[PDB]
Ligand binder design. Sequence first.
Ligand code: HEM
Ligand code: HEM
Ligand code: HEM
Ligand code: HEM
Lengths: 141, 141, 146, 146
Amino acid sequence: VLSPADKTNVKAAWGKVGAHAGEYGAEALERMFLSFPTTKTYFPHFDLSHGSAQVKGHGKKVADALTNAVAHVDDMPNALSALSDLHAHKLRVDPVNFKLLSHCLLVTLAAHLPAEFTPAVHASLDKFLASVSTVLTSKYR
Amino acid sequence: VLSPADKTNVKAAWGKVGAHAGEYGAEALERMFLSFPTTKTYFPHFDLSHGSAQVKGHGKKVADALTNAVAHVDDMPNALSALSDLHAHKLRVDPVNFKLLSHCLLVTLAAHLPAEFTPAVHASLDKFLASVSTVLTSKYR
Amino acid sequence: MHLTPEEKSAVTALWGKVNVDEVGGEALGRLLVVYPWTQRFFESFGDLSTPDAVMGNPKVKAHGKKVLGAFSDGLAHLDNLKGTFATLSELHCDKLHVDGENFRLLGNVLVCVLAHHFGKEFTPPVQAAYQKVVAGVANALAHKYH
Amino acid sequence: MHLTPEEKSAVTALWGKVNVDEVGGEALGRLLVVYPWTQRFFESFGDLSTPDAVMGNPKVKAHGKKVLGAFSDGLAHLDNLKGTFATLSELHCDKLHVDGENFRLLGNVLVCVLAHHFGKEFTPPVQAAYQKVVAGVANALAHKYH
Ligand code: HEM
Ligand code: HEM
Ligand code: HEM
Ligand code: HEM
């Protein structure tokens, strides 16, 4: 469960992301695809080449959803209902993959927000991505 | 979340276990020790030989807790509170190990309740053990 | 694949008793039932709405048999699973687009099916041997992903 | 390893720029902070009650340097991680009783530390090669568990 310190830590870190959230979304996708090629199985219809507009667009979409999640950190289940649905009944992404994307997002944040990626903030963002993962896979069965 | 159907399935299968829960808990442990040797690192102090009383003793304890969670299917977080703290604060068993034991408990039940281990029951028991594991790991960080 | 002489004997002795048509259908059906997200690859199979609709689906039964057939053959080449499974690996990746994690889900389900069928005969040490095997096979099937 | 010469060179080249002292202390510390349950092995190190107490703990920093030390030497035997870590694998199992899963957590933490330090330099492709290395190392260290 996210403690008040966690929530603050997350709000802070994400605050610094700002107008780059989209780029970081796209970058995390690219690192996932290259590091865990099994993840690519879910995107047969995309051009997964570097700098692909499909990848960029999707990166934005994910980034945007994360933002809305930070903003409703106290009410995630509710803020992500629609998304929980899409994932459990339409996309049906295996749950192990949420852990891969979460890891690539940390790696991306670390590389871009050195001053802000402290041990305490690292711990909070990790818990955070884990909660978001839990919410997104809660209606699977 | 467990559905009414899930609940009925679980009480029914566990119902059939009855007096053998202890014995089934012991076998589940042995199965786990043999298939996933890394789980043994948590029992350096145990005699892990076949027919070890320590294992016998431990299997009974695990089986009692599961019986108690079935008895309190509508309030598992509270019925398992104490065990959740123990695991989080003293034992500090890495979370992946819960999935391993869960798996060995399902094998154990499958081997003993052929007539009851139907597809529907299998699905319910898997969801149930996943729920117990979630509770037991909830206060980890 | 750390199959000791004795683990290999044990795998092979029991596989002797298996009705692959049957076990195949049971394993695949249970997969689609226990992990419903896996139904994503079979929308041309018809009705998978309930357990009975799944387990009884002639299409699931036929596919299961096919899958377990390929698996059985893998059991004859424990020495070279990667080689044995290379064309199938490329097909699941490149054509089917099947996430590799599915191979591990099936493996576990299969182990539950073997236990269900053999009861007491599926001893702790026999399971441990089969655990090595389904992992070996899962690895071999994912070896050509890129 | 199943490292491409190019992947081999990427790893090797970045590593040359690494301060093991600082990267080692930081990887181990982040480990004890992000996954608090790993502290179970370091009771004797002192106060690990806070990120600050962990990060500043000299025993932690020093164990971290010993660990990255051994990791560093393993990068010189990337074609036989198994034989390089056999003695250390038995030690971890039989003496230390460290769950193999910990090797995996450390790996991921290591990659986050490298990204943190090298920023721009730690590109997706370089990360991909490091993921392959941490996996291989984790596998070698858990190889002799029984
Ligand atoms: C941190 C967790 C995640 C978040 C917040 C997230 C968010 C989203 C969002 C916002 C969309 C767009 C919905 C729309 O198109 O209206 C989406 C779609 C999608 N997601 Fe998820 N996602 C997450 C994890 C994953 C993972 C791990 C995978 C697979 C590896 C995945 C696979 C997909 C796919 C295949 C689509 C549809 C893409 C398309 O056809 O355009 N998602 N996700
Ligand atoms: C659903 C799964 C689990 C249940 C229901 C469970 C329940 C219990 C119970 C009732 C006890 C005894 C506490 C007492 O003294 O009253 C216990 C102790 C313990 N458990 Fe858990 N546990 C589970 C999972 C695990 C796993 C997966 C591991 C490690 C692989 C583990 C490791 C331990 C250890 C090391 C102890 C202390 C044993 C001793 O020293 O006697 N547990 N558990
Ligand atoms: C032991 C693991 C497996 C083996 C040995 C195996 C084997 C096979 C074989 C022999 C075929 C037919 C090849 C062809 O059409 O040319 C096939 C097709 C297929 N497999 Fe696999 N399979 C395995 C696991 C899985 C899993 C777990 C899934 C999905 C959860 C899956 C999804 C499929 C699909 C969707 C097809 C195509 C069905 C169609 O004809 O439309 N496989 N597999
Ligand atoms: C990259 C993976 C790792 C490597 C290469 C590694 C290497 C080492 C080495 C070289 C030693 C020195 C002991 C001796 O030679 O007598 C050691 C000790 C030890 N390691 Fe590992 N280690 C790794 C991961 C871990 C992890 C993840 C943990 C737990 C979080 C751990 C727990 C310990 C402990 C408790 C000791 C004993 C230190 C002492 O004596 O106080 N190791 N390790």
